Amino acid sequence: SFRFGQHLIKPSVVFLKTELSFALVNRKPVVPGHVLVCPLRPVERFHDLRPDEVADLFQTTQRVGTVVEKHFHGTSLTFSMQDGPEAGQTVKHVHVHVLPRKAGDASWRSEEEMAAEAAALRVYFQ
Amino acid sequence: SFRFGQHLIKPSVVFLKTELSFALVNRKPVVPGHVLVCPLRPVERFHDLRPDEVADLFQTTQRVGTVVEKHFHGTSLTFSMQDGPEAGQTVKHVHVHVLPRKAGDASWRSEEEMAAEAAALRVYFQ
């Protein structure tokens, strides 16, 4: 019951939801712990978000980053927002990729492995 | 009179300063219009910023992005925060790289070309 571009995201793979944003696990993680933080409102471009959505998207991103860097044993984090088509945006919904980074660094999984990861992550926001 | 890690940044190359953040031009742009948005307080890791600094850093980033994408004729934007050492962080001060992106895409310049760019950019925040 979360929109992401034109896909409906099952709650089981969503591990955080605030008043204006939500975070989900990826079907295709680039690295372990690769997660996405999106505003609840589906806007395509970042300039479309209102000031309060911007504050919340990034305060949630901060919280999510801390959790995934801990949980997936990274020693750093990469945050990247591909804003727009010439920037790599495939799904047209503003979102931040958060990736746990570690020294010197398919991986496709099931809806159930996704849901198990999300459940693990939910424990850090209790 | 702006700290950036352990460097002091001359105001002439800074084109926006809010209550908690500031934006500067790069000595080494990756692409035309590559600019940086940093909090005024020098914290190394993103988790170190307070909630209000986080909101402001990213609301300023939003504003800066719009301006540089316009001014440097890009059709998209890439936002990337390398948070931490294993993520590529050379200068230890939280900062967002904002890069104007266009279809299909040294470049080192003088303090005066930097200051001229900053001046151009300042006109969009008047």
From Swiss-Prot, chains A, B:
UniProt-annotated binding residues for substrate: 7, 26, 82, 88-91, 97
PROSITE patterns, alphabetized: HIT_1, HIT_2
Assembly information from the UniProt record: Homodimer. Interacts with UBE2I. Interacts with MDM2. Interacts with CTNNB1. Identified in a complex with CTNNB1 and LEF1.
EC number: 3.6.1.29, 3.9.1.-, 3.6.2.1, 2.7.7.51
GO process annotations (BP): diadenosine triphosphate catabolic process; intrinsic apoptotic signaling pathway by p53 class mediator; negative regulation of proteasomal ubiquitin-dependent protein catabolic process; purine nucleotide metabolic process
Disease: A chromosomal aberration involving FHIT has been found in a lymphoblastoid cell line established from a family with renal cell carcinoma and thyroid carcinoma. Translocation t(3;8)(p14.2;q24.1) with RNF139. Although the 3p14.2 breakpoint has been shown to interrupt FHIT in its 5-prime non-coding region, it is unlikely that FHIT is causally related to renal or other malignancies. Associated with digestive tract cancers. Numerous tumor types are found to have aberrant forms of FHIT protein due to deletions in a coding region of chromosome 3p14.2 including the fragile site locus FRA3B.
Keywords noted in UniProt: Apoptosis, Chromosomal rearrangement, Cytoplasm, Hydrolase, Manganese, Mitochondrion, Nucleotide-binding, Nucleus, Phosphoprotein, Transcription, Transcription regulation, Transferase, Tumor suppressor
Known catalytic reactions: P(1),P(3)-bis(5'-adenosyl) triphosphate + H2O = AMP + ADP + 2 H(+); adenosine 5'-phosphosulfate + H2O = sulfate + AMP + 2 H(+); adenosine 5'-phosphosulfate + NH4(+) = adenosine 5'-phosphoramidate + sulfate + 2 H(+); adenosine 5'-phosphoramidate + H2O = AMP + NH4(+)
Intracellular or extracellular location(s): Cytoplasm; Mitochondrion; Nucleus
Effect upon mutating residue 9 to W: Strongly reduces affinity for substrates and impairs apoptosis
SUPFAM superfamilies documented for this protein: HIT-like (SSF54197)
Active-site residue list: 95 (tele-amp-histidine intermediate)
PANTHER family: BIS(5'-ADENOSYL)-TRIPHOSPHATASE
Organism expressing this protein natively: Homo sapiens
Annotated function: Possesses dinucleoside triphosphate hydrolase activity. Cleaves P(1)-P(3)-bis(5'-adenosyl) triphosphate (Ap3A) to yield AMP and ADP. Can also hydrolyze P(1)-P(4)-bis(5'-adenosyl) tetraphosphate (Ap4A), but has extremely low activity with ATP. Exhibits adenylylsulfatase activity, hydrolyzing adenosine 5'-phosphosulfate to yield AMP and sulfate. Exhibits adenosine 5'-monophosphoramidase activity, hydrolyzing purine nucleotide phosphoramidates with a single phosphate group such as adenosine 5'monophosphoramidate (AMP-NH2) to yield AMP and NH2.
Entries under Pfam families matching the protein: HIT
Source organism superkingdom: Eukaryota
Gene3D superfamilies linked to this entry: HIT-like (3.30.428.10)
Protein name listed in UniProt: Bis(5'-adenosyl)-triphosphatase
Residue intervals of the HIT domain: 1-105
Gene Ontology CC terms, in alphabetical order: cytoplasm; cytosol; fibrillar center; mitochondrion; nucleus; plasma membrane
